[PDB]
Amino acid sequence: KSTIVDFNPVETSFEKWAKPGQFSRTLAKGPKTTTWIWNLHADAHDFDIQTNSLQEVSRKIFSAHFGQLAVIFLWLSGMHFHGAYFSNYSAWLTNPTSTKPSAQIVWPIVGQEVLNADVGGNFQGIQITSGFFQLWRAEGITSEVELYWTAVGGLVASFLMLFAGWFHYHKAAPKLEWFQNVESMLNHHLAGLLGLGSLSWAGHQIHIALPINKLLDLGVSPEEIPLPYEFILNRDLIAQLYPSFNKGLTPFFTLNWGEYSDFLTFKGGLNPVTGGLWLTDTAHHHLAIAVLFIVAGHMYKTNWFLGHSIKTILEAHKGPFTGEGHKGLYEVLTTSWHAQLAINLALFGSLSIIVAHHMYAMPPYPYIAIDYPTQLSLFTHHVWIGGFCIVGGAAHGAIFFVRDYNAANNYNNLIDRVIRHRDAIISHLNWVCIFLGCHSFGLYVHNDTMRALGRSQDLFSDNAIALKPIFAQFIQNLHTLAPGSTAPNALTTVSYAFGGDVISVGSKIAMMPISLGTADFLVHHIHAFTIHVTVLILLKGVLYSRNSRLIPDKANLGFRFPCDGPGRGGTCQVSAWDHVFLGLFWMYNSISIVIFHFSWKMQSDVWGTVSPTGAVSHITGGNFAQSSITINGWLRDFLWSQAAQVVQSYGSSLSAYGLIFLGAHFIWAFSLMFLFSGRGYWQELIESIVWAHNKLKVAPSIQPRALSITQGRAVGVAHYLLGGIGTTWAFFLARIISV
Amino acid sequence: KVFSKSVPFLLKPAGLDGMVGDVGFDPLGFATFIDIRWLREAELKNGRVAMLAFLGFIVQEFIRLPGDLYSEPNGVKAFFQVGPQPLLQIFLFCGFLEFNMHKGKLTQVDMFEDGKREPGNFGFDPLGFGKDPAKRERYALAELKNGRLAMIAIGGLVHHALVTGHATF
């Protein structure tokens, strides 16, 4: 009878497994039409409509989190197992600059063995662009046995998380008060999870990754490198590489932290041997992060007369312009899972995009900057994940507004005041979007039409009307001057992208000053415009989710509904879901432009080879500066030019990329059937098909119905995203692996 | 609880009661989700085919027919040397037999739909063995046991020919 958990709440039985739709009150009666099948999967994780108790929803969410973490652990275990058994990691360790990472071999069936490429190191397989080899090398993993043991540990951890989810749904489910301890949860997630994870990783780096990687960079082969445990039992194997361990932990406890400058450095730049960040800098960074997060975890009052109450902090932040201020926000975020999901997903996607930027900007792994496929894939993948997560955060903000928003509890607070002037916000955001689009894109079109008319001096180019990004160049200058002036204890700039020397590893450029000209001005304003339009769609969905001048009772129709009818001139897509659908489209557009800008700019003005005398030759040859300013330039010198490797991949080991290119084109075009058409035509065609089936006595008892309007839109957008992202995926991968 | 006589640590399977080979052997409960009459018909036919095929092995390796085609002591290699023409005639003759012996109703859903069909009872008894009902049950049990033994032995002989290649001897 614990005060935090309920014991044996749900019986572990297979009876409900044999009753599909048991969770829903409407679906429990059984299918009558094929719409029931689709409704079954669309409501599976909508725990809000399955129970009327916040406690039950919270417990379901907790167990679902455990299942998700078990799935993630299984995926990581699979990655490590493939590295251990079906990879050339050992060969890549001895030749990182000449062996391509491969960790998946393809069975010899139907002639598909051509996919096993010549990745080097007496190996055949698919080249890997996830950068696991570089990460494992940065971890100090020098043998495939360690990868096998990490895979075994991942399997054990996945089983543990599965057992935890089962235990906390069926044997000991926490109570609502336990879930609502946001102060305790924040304290623990900030100190324990974040800070202690940073501290543990700093310890691992210092004791395992720092010596092993230093020996690897010195040229010591992985076979004669001591086993990682020997660096702990023997204080002399690590004190030779870093002659500060001879003093032990006495400098730490005597506040003489200057003695540890051997392995806790602040250098900046990149390791000249590997092209990645100095691992001493990384260990010092993780140590500082650990201390900062542990300190930050002692902020909120949990169980003693010590710390802050988030309710008292929010309620004190009022103002003349904001009425009641943040009063009621604590109740909103402690009684609505959707609001927490909105905030967490938005910040999580933004964090993913920031991670993507800082990855290539400052390569943190050895021999990852010179693996161009890995860098391109990591950036594009993380930016895509960030965009999807941001759209999801907007969607769940809209869901909270529709479902969990209480008008009485939010009288004259920030949420109320935002809804009260939603018109002004949306109208000014509309004006900003029109201004930004007009300018950015019409400058592009003006360049295109001036070039087409033979007026080269009328373009918005560097040798013409020039739009120099002076503000960004000022920041670039400030960073390259930071070491010794504003960061006096730095030896080198944080990233060579801001300026400095060309860093090359094995005649391949790792990082180099990224010059910003009029071409970068236009593409940056294109980014701003696309982001603003996506924000416009999502914010219009969130703010007008409850009511509008069209439908004053839109909240009574729910978050997900197709329309209110053909009246009022037509009330299609007025939902808030139909705004997360359009916003998904615009996020695809924005992220596609972002990754295109990254790919072309890097290939044209960063990546390449360096001659022995210091001459820099890039992959494309600097065509970004003069040919990325017109739409015809993007079509020809980027799309047409770099699509050559994809279309000429047939018969080679990259033929799978051409096949996926074609299939993604097919899927993207397939989406337009659902996006352009309507439900009535398909229902009436199914009518004649059903007539034929009845004529042959083969009409199913479950009456076949065309997909609902909302499901038709969902299928269309899912296929559109899959096709477009897969086309860009195949194009990028084939292009950057070939060259 | 009764518990099976064959598998003594398992409960007695259902649906086998009035049969001529009941020793309570059905751990997987195949008689619960498959018609017992169809199962006995299939067991009897498989057994009879296996008995004929085992006798065919032993005779083929010994006697054989005159001709270049019929000159392989190994049954597995004889299946290939004989060619498709003699085998397809056997296939068509067996099909004709199947059609005429079951009188049209050949499938799992069609056979035993009207009942009045003892499993495995084609009425084939020209030599008259089986007029006395006292020995009829013993003959049925002997046929079942010989059929099962011949299924095991037919598999054994076929796989011996595959792993060695010469003959059975």
Binding site: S13, F14, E15, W17, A18, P20, I109, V110, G111 | P84
Partner: protein
């Protein structure tokens, strides 16, 4: 094991098992007799 067998009798599990078996015997036919453009006979 009365409701577990009923769960295995659901449409998704049965379709997954049948399609896995189908792809399996197709792939194995194409392994043992590869590159079959015409009928073997």
């Amino acid at each position: 094991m009365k409701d577990f067998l009923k769960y295995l009798s659901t449409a998704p599990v049965l379709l997954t098992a049948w399609l896995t078996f189908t792809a399996g015997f197709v792939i194995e036919i194409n392994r043992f007799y590869p590159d079959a453009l015409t009928f073997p006979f």
